Design a protein around this ligand. Sequence first.
Ligand SMILES: [Ca+2]
Ligand SMILES: [Cl-]
Ligand SMILES: [Cl-]
Length: 675
Amino acid sequence: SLFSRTPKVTVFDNRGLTARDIAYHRHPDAPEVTNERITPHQYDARGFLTQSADPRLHDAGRVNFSYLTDLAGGVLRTQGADNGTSVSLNDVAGRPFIVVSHISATTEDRSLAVTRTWQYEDAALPGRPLNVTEQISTEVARITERFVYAGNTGAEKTLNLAGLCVRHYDTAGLVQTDSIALTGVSLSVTRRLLKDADNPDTVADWQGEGASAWNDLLSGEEYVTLTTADATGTVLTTTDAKGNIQRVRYDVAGLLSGSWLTVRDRTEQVIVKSLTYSAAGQKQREDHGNGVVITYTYEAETQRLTGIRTERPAGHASGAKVLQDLRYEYDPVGNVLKITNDAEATRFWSNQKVVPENTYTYDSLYQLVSATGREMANVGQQGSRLPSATVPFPTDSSAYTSYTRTYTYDEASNLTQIRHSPATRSGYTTNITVSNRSNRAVLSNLTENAADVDALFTAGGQQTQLQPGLGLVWTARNELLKVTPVDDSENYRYDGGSQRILKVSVQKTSAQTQRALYLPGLELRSAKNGDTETESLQVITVGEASRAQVRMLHWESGRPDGITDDKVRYSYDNLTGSSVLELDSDGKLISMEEYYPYGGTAVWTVRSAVEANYKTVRYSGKERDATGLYYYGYRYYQPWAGRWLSADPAGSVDGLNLYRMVRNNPVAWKDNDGR
Ligand SMILES: [Ca+2]
Ligand SMILES: [Cl-]
Ligand SMILES: [Cl-]
């Protein structure tokens, strides 16, 4: 009835090119009404795409993208509503030669334009890249990257280095590759940072006649990551920069069967004792170092994840208990209709039979239009801040009250309203104002007028204000550089591939400071109370960033009382990889967290006060910063707004809307990296 006669339709021109994509929108609220949505695409004489537009902007006679191509189809220019105008040219060898971006159309505002260029080896060499250059506006060009290659001396061959880049100087400093396997895996890499790398004023500029000069712009400290690998070129062990060793083992089918951690100067301990798999190679039964067992359950027909059961089993020293018994009910195409948890200790849902347990409804476009859950009664209205930690664990259904969210979407799939309706309290509404000529959008408190929305973004689609009186600065490569209030700042540094290597937070009244350095399987965290160290911390992280991760906290200095050194924190995730429970090495609950569909926190409780401040990874297995943003990798996310802080750097690959979050269906799908 709701989904009847609502196909996806592809309309061709007379050359078999897609002139229109047609979709059929229907809300369950109004099942009588069906809104036809036409996405037109134009092609030129050759048959290359020239224009695309979403239904909302076509309706208003405007366009989302214009493309200008060379005669082979290579796109020399893109004018985007969301991400501005950019010009591109590859050389005859197919390599990047020049890209000019940060340009706005009215002819063309070129004044803030970034020009990125490449320099290769001369024609008598193979043509490997030598440097990348970036020139902004009227400023002098800066050399942002350099590459140095190995020859093929006997020593180099002995390290499998011949002709490969051994020194890559990037936006954060140097990455040095000292050894490679027969199988091609890097066995020893070494990172050095720029001098004065905590200051967002310092940019990479690799000026100088040779490596002796470039190295003089680097800090002294070396962070060496070592690796061991099997005959298939698959990782067996990793030694981090502070000497902590992670080890894994593979079963007869090549799947992970066990893992261990050897903290520097300790003995090896079991992190994953055993791990079995279904016929499809998906996790079946997982046994942790803390004796906790995870049992995964799959629909036999569709292979969809039906159950996640976490428990301390029979004969466990801390006593048997089912900590989680998640069950999922899908509609035919695999949207999540219902989530139940019978292990829930409070027994909250069988007490409150007015609103049902995590029920979800969708429109014909599989956008989430309604959701129900529980929040802690005390949370109050959602903003950027995390709720206060409830300590100790609540012990009764009074602690949590039910809620019902309702979501409203425009013709271009912008999330314009999150309406919150609790059981017995005053509800609130978050309104998001969409631009009249783009998918740029901000909260109503920033503006309620469509025509002023694009002025809160740079040409490239980067948001300049996070909240009222909090300002945002972006790098030449559209990465978040700095959050500044208009007196607590935060700033960031990235490597060559836009992956965050550094985060520094500063509060000046005396100036208090915290620093996070992100390395392979290791975060070196510190703090100073005015050039005097209060805290020094290794977060050893075991596993992969898209799976239920295990963290080990080792203090070099400044350990708070109430935390035993080298305490392991096991994380336990839901369908979408959000960190929901933490257990300790006895299998006992440390914390529990639950989420509103789009990633705001609705429950946050911890057994102690001091333990609450050491869980960074939360929604989608990603770090929530003190700003309230989630760092995904290539972009930062706003859980209160249910949308990205900047335009998709991959363009229209995932859809025309460059700010939309996981096709507006955050309960099933999960954005891996923000690209
Ligand atoms: Ca349909
Ligand atoms: Cl417990
Ligand atoms: Cl939400």
